[PDB]
Design a protein around this ligand. Structure first.
Ligand SMILES: NC(=O)c1ccc[n+]([C@@H]2O[C@H](COP(=O)([O-])OP(=O)(O)OC[C@H]3O[C@@H](n4cnc5c(N)ncnc54)[C@H](O)[C@@H]3O)[C@@H](O)[C@H]2O)c1
Ligand SMILES: NC(=O)c1ccc[n+]([C@@H]2O[C@H](COP(=O)([O-])OP(=O)(O)OC[C@H]3O[C@@H](n4cnc5c(N)ncnc54)[C@H](O)[C@@H]3O)[C@@H](O)[C@H]2O)c1
Lengths: 251, 251, 251, 251
């Protein structure tokens, strides 16, 4: 009994599309009638995901490091050559940077998390917004985290980067509010994906204990809301934050 | 290009269903396959709305003052006799109480706004939750306001009541988080309905000036998100607040 | 090493002044040079508290039920007869209403908590604000709770009442923003106003598990911030919420 | 009638101390009995500010780029040689980065704002926290902005950097909550640190239209709250955000 999201005729770019939440978003988008451009850093995994997802619809895989402007420019070009538009942008491709106190983390890792998780979505938005303006239509969905609302201990870099991504979402949504391009963020709690391998077990336990629903988020459940925000039904919500924390968040 | 929300086989109670946002929710729910129990104080208008909406699906109209426990009990009984379940509850039936400073409003009007807008949804939830527990399923959607997030000047009673409704939503969602009944609120900005007749023109202008999208909310747009929250696709969001303010709200 | 708050020549009304946080605020206000009007329900506890506090400065004990307009009017008159002004209003008369799920609490207790915790501060503000407008100066501090930010399970009435009090604070602060009367709320965690039952150590452990500082708030610590908000140095903060949750709150 | 903040015997580091809010904080800290280490980039402005402030108490001027680990290490050493401790850290070195839409700002300016406004305070905290842990005491105050709560249009980099700084504050406060080092942020509105161009009265009117108090924040008013958060009376607030927006912020 899933809702039938209407993405017919639309083109959806998904960063981080090779695995995890991004891959589940790709599956649901293809089942909703979209063409999907799957953007990811991991060229080998991306090839396997492309061939799996092609069974569901039109897919174009693009290898891109979303911290590098020149690679993003080439990715926009390849996407437009395949499909002719970018109607929907899902920024999904973050890293955790491991766990440690603010003063014990390595500064190069702190900077890397800010680069991948905050600078990256900024650079992708900078490249894609002019195309959405050209179209007179777009939807942008930034995948943040409940950590960006809350400031998790032992995850200061991750939390600051996702809090910053929420701030970017609020500014960009207000800049585009009269231009038919709506821009929102989602705040998931932990979902059991491969990103768990980059964290300490005690941090995973901590994240679970704070969830009133008493289980982790499933990627398919995340995709339901993410693609709602990528659809025309999302019509009067912009610069806003939509929660996926299983009852945890208090705002 | 609207999404097809799957409410097939479900029963939706809508308070305030005779007009405005509640009526638009009823239309969309019927088009989504739900049976609708339309609850409202205005017995005459409710009869006209029932006969209009019956063209779209199964409708049972129920006259009820949602400040009166005994009338709510009778309304639950009438709804169950018609349709056998209450799967979804949309609390929509608020009043504004006019406009004036906190110290110049009449205390009886201040109390009346709290009664209708906060006590009322509490009493309806109290009566309906045991039925949802009996079913092993429910969705509750409380229609608050951006005023409940922000505290509008000259609307202290309305703002306090809607802020209180958000607090109730957060408590109730956490109480039910392991019971398969998810509970969320929405925060609309102003929509041009008959509720405008109860406010001063300068307050209407104030509300509009704060909207980055530069227009009012349409009832049909509100219904898209309200019924998403009333669907099974809403799966890992509870005790949460979903915005409909056209870019205004900053949280 | 406590700060010396300058309340010299100011008159402070404290509701709930005979007990708990209100009593600690009274002690600190007298030590800061204020005259204090202690407003409370229990004439006997008031008389005892007045005798103790008179050793610190000028105190007027006022018996008043802050849910009753006529008693508030008599209380304002008695305060003005004693001291000639009301410069600062501290609303600290809240009750908890016990604990239970939203659908199992008694409706009359739900209503009583709304009346005491939300209607009461509204009624006191509506009587006191006109006096502050005559003076051209005032400070209002509403004691809310972290429950008003978060929606605690099994405390839906308490949480809704405190969330509503925060909404009132936001509206009233904006109404008075050019009138030299600043209006703010505080959100304490679990405050150690009472030694709990010797059999509830498990529940005490649970409450402390939500507080990163791993102890309860002391009333004297609350009074430091409450009276800062009651002082002239609070100069550019209004309609705002100041946290006292020991690291718990995430906004 | 200002409060007498007790900073007797304490050492306060102020980044951005030569100008604006940082200079006003220095004046108030010296008047409160503190020794002040003024940290700033401009040796010339630092020397002028040091000469003026030395009339109020003990001051050590430290030339440091707070984006450079090696310079921060030299700055901590010079501060400890002069004064023997760092009890209080005020991070007040932010830049605006100009204005423009998200897609038209220069990426190197976007990165520079993140570096100065988010990476810099992180680097200063990582050097100073170990010293506060050796002392068994500290207070950290991060000067953020209302833009970090709200996401101002045409200031996406500034807003994201300040939102990220708030996230860092929340994580670091919780990491230190049992270590006697409390960590909080302030959110000023438009502060009158500089007289704006004589031709921008229309833009000044627009900024003031968003502030209910209808004037700009004064640096000395900001310093009252900033140093309260730097004092022992700030005792049960950590990982929190204290507002200085003149009624604008809605959380
Ligand atoms: N998984 C969770 O529990 C969880 C919780 C909260 C938020 N989130 C967020 O959701 C998003 C998806 O998480 P996930 O669990 O699917 O993660 P994941 O590790 O399974 O997948 C992330 C993907 O991003 C790609 N990627 C990383 N850096 C990149 C870069 N510079 N350029 C391009 N691609 C890059 C990786 O190759 C990978 O395929 C992330 O932004 C994450 O922060 C996840
Ligand atoms: N319309 C807006 O601009 C706007 C903005 C923000 C929030 N909201 C909220 O959305 C909801 C719907 O607003 P609307 O514009 O459709 O209002 P409306 O005035 O058009 O309809 C409200 C309905 O509620 C009914 N009602 C009132 N008191 C009742 C009671 N005690 N018991 C039962 N029914 C009762 C009325 O008869 C009416 O049919 C309200 O809760 C309102 O506060 C509306």
């Amino acid at each position: 009994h899933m809702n039938r999201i209407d993405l017919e005729g639309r083109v959806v770019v998904i960063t981080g599309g090779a695995r995890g939440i991004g891959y589940a978003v790709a599956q649901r988008a293809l089942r909703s009638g979209a063409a999907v451009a799957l953007w990811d850093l991991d060229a080998e995994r991306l090839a396997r995901s492309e061939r799996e997802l092609a069974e569901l619809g039109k897919v174009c895989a693009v290898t891109v490091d979303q911290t590098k402007e020149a690679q993003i420019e080439a990715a926009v070009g390849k996407t437009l050559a395949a499909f002719g538009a970018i109607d929907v942008l899902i920024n999904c491709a973050g890293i955790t940077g491991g766990n440690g106190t603010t003063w014990e983390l390595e500064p190069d890792v702190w900077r890397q998390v800010i680069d991948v998780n905050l600078i990256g979505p900024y650079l992708v938005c900078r490249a894609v917004v002019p195309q959405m303006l050209k179209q007179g239509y777009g939807r942008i969905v930034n995948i943040a985290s409940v950590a960006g609302k809350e400031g998790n201990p032992n995850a200061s870099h991750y939390s600051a980067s996702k809090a910053g991504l929420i701030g970017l979402t609020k500014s960009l949504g207000k800049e585009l509010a009269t231009k038919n391009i709506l821009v929102n963020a989602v705040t998931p709690a932990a979902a059991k994906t491969e990103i768990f391998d980059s964290m300490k077990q005690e941090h995973i336990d901590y994240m679970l204990s704070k969830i009133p629903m008493n289980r982790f988020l499933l990627p398919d459940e995340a995709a339901s809301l993410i693609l709602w925000l990528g659809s025309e039904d999302c019509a009067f919500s912009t610069g806003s934050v939509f929660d996926l924390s299983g009852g945890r968040a208090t705002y």
